[PDB]
């Protein structure tokens, strides 16, 4: 990663769990590190980033196509699509504040949505682009 992405994940995690919806759909189950226990089963997960270095002569920036996946164990997955509807409106047009550097925009990209393991879990990825500035 570049210098910003340590604080970019800390900002897009704190923008979640303060959004009013998805505190009523997913609950407290927004985490990178999944805590030990019984695995609630409608969680979201925010880790797999990748950077693209949109830089210049004066300073440097980056383009983060970070992935926020929504997992559900429900029978259908209109549960996950309702949960990622709550993910995406919390992030597009972010106006976040970072700890190191700035971001200028948080857009949306590809969002694959398929059946993952043994046709039982339903995971829907959400790729968001974050053009940041170091």
């Amino acid at each position: 990663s570049y210098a910003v992405a340590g604080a970019l994940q800390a900002a897009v995690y704190q923008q979640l769990r303060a959004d009013a919806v998805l505190a009523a759909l997913v609950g407290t189950a927004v985490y990178d590190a999944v805590p030990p226990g019984p695995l609630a089963g409608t969680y979201v997960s925010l880790g797999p980033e990748d950077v693209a270095d949109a830089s210049d002569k004066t300073g440097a920036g980056a383009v983060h196509d970070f992935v926020i996946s929504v997992i559900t164990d429900a029978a259908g997955f209109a549960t996950a699509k309702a949960a990622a509807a709550a993910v995406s409106d919390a992030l597009v047009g972010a106006d976040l504040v970072l700890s190191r550097g700035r971001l200028v925009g948080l857009w949306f990209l590809r969002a694959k949505a398929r059946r993952v393991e043994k046709a039982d879990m339903r995971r829907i990825d959400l790729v968001f682009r974050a053009r940041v500035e170091g």
């Binding site: 999944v34 019984p38 695995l39 429900a74 029978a75 259908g76 209109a78 549960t79 879990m121």
Partner: protein, 110 residues
Amino acid sequence: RPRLNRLLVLEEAVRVADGAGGHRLDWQAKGEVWAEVTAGSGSERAGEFVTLASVPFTIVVRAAPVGAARRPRPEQRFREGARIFRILAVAERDREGHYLSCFAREEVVA
């Protein structure tokens, strides 16, 4: 022949359908059955973004004809307290048909 020593709550989820072709699961409790649970070799498994912890757990209940509530179906699950045993299949151990083989996972997220 099995020593049915452990008590397991059979659980069937009633399937309320939603708008988009799927169902909603709530897992109300069915009756309680007695069964022996025999662990297989357990190890971690790469989950989705979890590091799960699974064990084979062949579970032996008494049998019933197929149109009865005492038959565990593979869409059901067991529960001893807060330990969710899934059911993979049921498979009729004995030649006479006295007992069944349930197959569980019991994957805690570790």
